[PDB]
Amino acid sequence: RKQEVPLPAVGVAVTGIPAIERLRFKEVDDEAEQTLDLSNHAADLTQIGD
Amino acid sequence: MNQVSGLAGKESFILTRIELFNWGGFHGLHQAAIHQDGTAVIGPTGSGKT
Amino acid sequence: SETRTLQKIREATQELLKYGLLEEASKPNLYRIVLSHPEEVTRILEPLDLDIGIDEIRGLLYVKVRLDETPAQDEWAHPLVRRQRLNLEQSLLVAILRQHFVAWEQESGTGASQAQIAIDDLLPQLQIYLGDPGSESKERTRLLTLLDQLKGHGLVTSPDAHERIVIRPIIAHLADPINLQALLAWLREQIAQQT
Amino acid sequence: SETRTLQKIREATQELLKYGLLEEASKPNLYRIVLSHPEEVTRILEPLDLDIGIDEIRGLLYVKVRLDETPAQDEWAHPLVRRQRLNLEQSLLVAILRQHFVAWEQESGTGASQAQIAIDDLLPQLQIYLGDPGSESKERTRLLTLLDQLKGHGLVTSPDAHERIVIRPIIAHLADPINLQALLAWLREQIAQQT
Amino acid sequence: TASLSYALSPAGSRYPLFGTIILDEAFSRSSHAVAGRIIAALREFGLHAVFITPNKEMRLLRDHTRSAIVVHRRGQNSNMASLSWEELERHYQRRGNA
Amino acid sequence: TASLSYALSPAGSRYPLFGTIILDEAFSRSSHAVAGRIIAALREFGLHAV
Numbered sequence: 001r002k003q004e005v006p007l008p009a010v011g012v013a014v015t016g017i018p019a020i021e022r023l024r025f026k027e028v029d030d031e032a033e034q035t036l037d038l039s040n041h042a043a044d045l046t047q048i049g050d
Numbered sequence: 051m052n053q054v055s056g057l058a059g060k061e062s063f064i065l066t067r068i069e070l071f072n073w074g075g076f077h078g079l080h081q082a083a084i085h086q087d088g089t090a091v092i093g094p095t096g097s098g099k100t
Numbered sequence: 101s102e103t104r105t106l107q108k109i110r111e112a113t114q115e116l117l118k119y120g121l122l123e124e125a126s127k128p129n130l131y132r133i134v135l136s137h138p139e140e141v142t143r144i145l146e147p148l149d150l151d152i153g154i155d156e157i158r159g160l161l162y163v164k165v166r167l168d169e170t171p172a173q174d175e176w177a178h179p180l181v182r183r184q185r186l187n188l189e190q191s192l193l194v195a196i197l198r199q200h201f202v203a204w205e206q207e208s209g210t211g212a213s214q215a216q217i218a219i220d221d222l223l224p225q226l227q228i229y230l231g232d233p234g235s236e237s238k239e240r241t242r243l244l245t246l247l248d249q250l251k252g253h254g255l256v257t258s259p260d261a262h263e264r265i266v267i268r269p270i271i272a273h274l275a276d277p278i279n280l281q282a283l284l285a286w287l288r289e290q291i292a293q294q295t
Numbered sequence: 296s297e298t299r300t301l302q303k304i305r306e307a308t309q310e311l312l313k314y315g316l317l318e319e320a321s322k323p324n325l326y327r328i329v330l331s332h333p334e335e336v337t338r339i340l341e342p343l344d345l346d347i348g349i350d351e352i353r354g355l356l357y358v359k360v361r362l363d364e365t366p367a368q369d370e371w372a373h374p375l376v377r378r379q380r381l382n383l384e385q386s387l388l389v390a391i392l393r394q395h396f397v398a399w400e401q402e403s404g405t406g407a408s409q410a411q412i413a414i415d416d417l418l419p420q421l422q423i424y425l426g427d428p429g430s431e432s433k434e435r436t437r438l439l440t441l442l443d444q445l446k447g448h449g450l451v452t453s454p455d456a457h458e459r460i461v462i463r464p465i466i467a468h469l470a471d472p473i474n475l476q477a478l479l480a481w482l483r484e485q486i487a488q489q490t
Numbered sequence: 491t492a493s494l495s496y497a498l499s500p501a502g503s504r505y506p507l508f509g510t511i512i513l514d515e516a517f518s519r520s521s522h523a524v525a526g527r528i529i530a531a532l533r534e535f536g537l538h539a540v541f542i543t544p545n546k547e548m549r550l551l552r553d554h555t556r557s558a559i560v561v562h563r564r565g566q567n568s569n570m571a572s573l574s575w576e577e578l579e580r581h582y583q584r585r586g587n588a
Numbered sequence: 589t590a591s592l593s594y595a596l597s598p599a600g601s602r603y604p605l606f607g608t609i610i611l612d613e614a615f616s617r618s619s620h621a622v623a624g625r626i627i628a629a630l631r632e633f634g635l636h637a638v
Contacts, residue, residue, distance in 0.1 A: 044570055
């Protein structure tokens with residue numbers, strides 16, 4: 001007697017509109033190394049062609 | 051020409067330093083110093099200037 | 101070129117849709133905004149076949165499915181209405197709730213949505229119908245499960261700390277004379293075949 | 296009192312709001328109608344800050360938040376469109392399907408009817424990055440579960456009668472394919488290094 | 491430049507408190523005399539300036555600046571350095587013999 | 589330049605019947621070697637340039 005009756009539909013909210021923008025992807029953590037590197041390097045050295 | 055150089059350092063913040071780090075092609079840490087009396091910049095097309 | 105509707109209207113309408121109803125004492129701003137442009141609201145919703153009723157005497161607004169261009173219909177079958185239809189078990193609680201709501205209104209006035217009841221009071225009421233399985237754990241479990249389903253339809257706030265709850269006034273517009281009459285008719289119809 | 300929108304347009308609108316999509320393969324005549332009447336559509340949607348993006352190559356209409364530029368919060372917040380962050384399995388499947396769609400259109404051009412992809416090859420691909428839950432049966436079951444979820448977002452068909460499936464052109468406009476491909480290449484490289 | 495200079499000059503001053511400015515493609519459309527007209531106006535407006543060029547028309551740059559910043563690309567890597575005009579002259583001469 | 593050669597040349601002939609092209613501010617922003625390579629492109633297409 002789990003039977004459905006035709007009562008009025010009041011308070012009909014709508015939400016969760018399926019817009020593609022709502023999608024975001026897993027924050028797959030990548031921890032190959034720590035970010036400790038800081039050096040200035042010789043990457044500011046000069047040598048150029050013709 | 052030279053008068054405004056006196057205005058530089060006296061009246062206004064004159065830029066002589068820039069440090070970058072893993073920005074664009076500047077891998078590691080770079081840095082170049084502006085000259086407080088006018089400075090040029092030069093390099094081939096697509097070298098990190100812009 | 102463009103004729104962007106009042107951004108304020110956009111906020112109020114989008115919120116109202118987000119919740120299906122809208123209560124003054126909680127969010128009076130969008131509430132008044134819709135009161136300010138009920139026609140614009142309506143024409144905005146009209147393409148969707150969603151329409152706004154109103155209850156100023158208690159501070160409520162809410163949607164309700166239109167009934168046009170596919171006459172009547174079981175409203176719930178509409179695509180956008182987002183939940184499954186009430187079921188007479190729920191309705192059995194619904195009637196009790198409405199009774200308490202109107203009873204409290206008829207002595208504290210219509211000046212608040214704060215019609216309140218304690219869960220334990222319901223227990224005897226259901227106990228008569230759903231019987232007495234003799235274990236407070238089972239009956240109270242089923243009671244809270246029903247209440248949960250209803251708050252899904254938004255009718256009643258979930259239990260507070262004091263095991264007391266507030267009936268949302270939208271209940272009244274559910275337990276309509278007209279709708280109650282259709283319900284009693286269909287119920288006597290069920291009785292006639294159950295026999 | 297008020298006139299009522301064209302029934303066909305209201306139909307297409309309501310469907311497009313239930314599923315965020317309308318397609319030549321699903322409601323092709325509604326598709327033609329809305330294409331002839333996009334201004335009506337956008338007008339209906341704009342009070343809600345909703346608006347369609349369109350794809351005439353692939354016969355796909357789809358929704359997209361209409362909010363304006365330079366917001367106070369750097370990224371939009373919309374009362375209706377709640378956002379999800381998928382579990383790795385789903386995201387991975389989506390990236391797989393995305394590059395699948397890209398490859399299919401690479402070899403067949405834009406708009407060419409999708410060829411079907413076999414569960415038989417999917418389970419390997421999942422195996423590429425997911426190892427094994429304990430059995431091939433569990434692999435297949437969870438694959439079909441996630442495919443069900445994906446069809447829930449309308450990005451794929453149902454598991455067809457032959458244990459293949461077809462891709463929904465909504466994939467052509469996901470949130471950020473760069474996130475997909477970075478993760479995909481990173482995953483394959485990570486497994487290649489680990490082994 | 492005039493609008494920028496006055497805008498940057500705080501109340502009670504006619505010169506830009508923020509003296510430094512950047513100028514990409516500093517003179518990629520004008521001949522050296524007219525470029526020098528810009529130089530005169532810009533500098534006269536109390537502006538400390540920096541100039542860019544895609545390896546073109548170096549003469550005027552040497553004339554009214556004191557140093558340069560050399561930048562070169564190597565594959566996907568970008569490199570920077572700050573030199574005076576004369577060190578660059580010596581390096582050029584080291585190339586000239588070849 | 590590739591496209592203009594396409595348009596200017598019917599099939600068969602290796603050169604377009606009108607071989608001349610005009611370049612305003614030609615090379616106004618390309619490093620010298622970059623300008624040389626663009627010139628080489630012009631020559632590959634086999635055009636008379638201004």
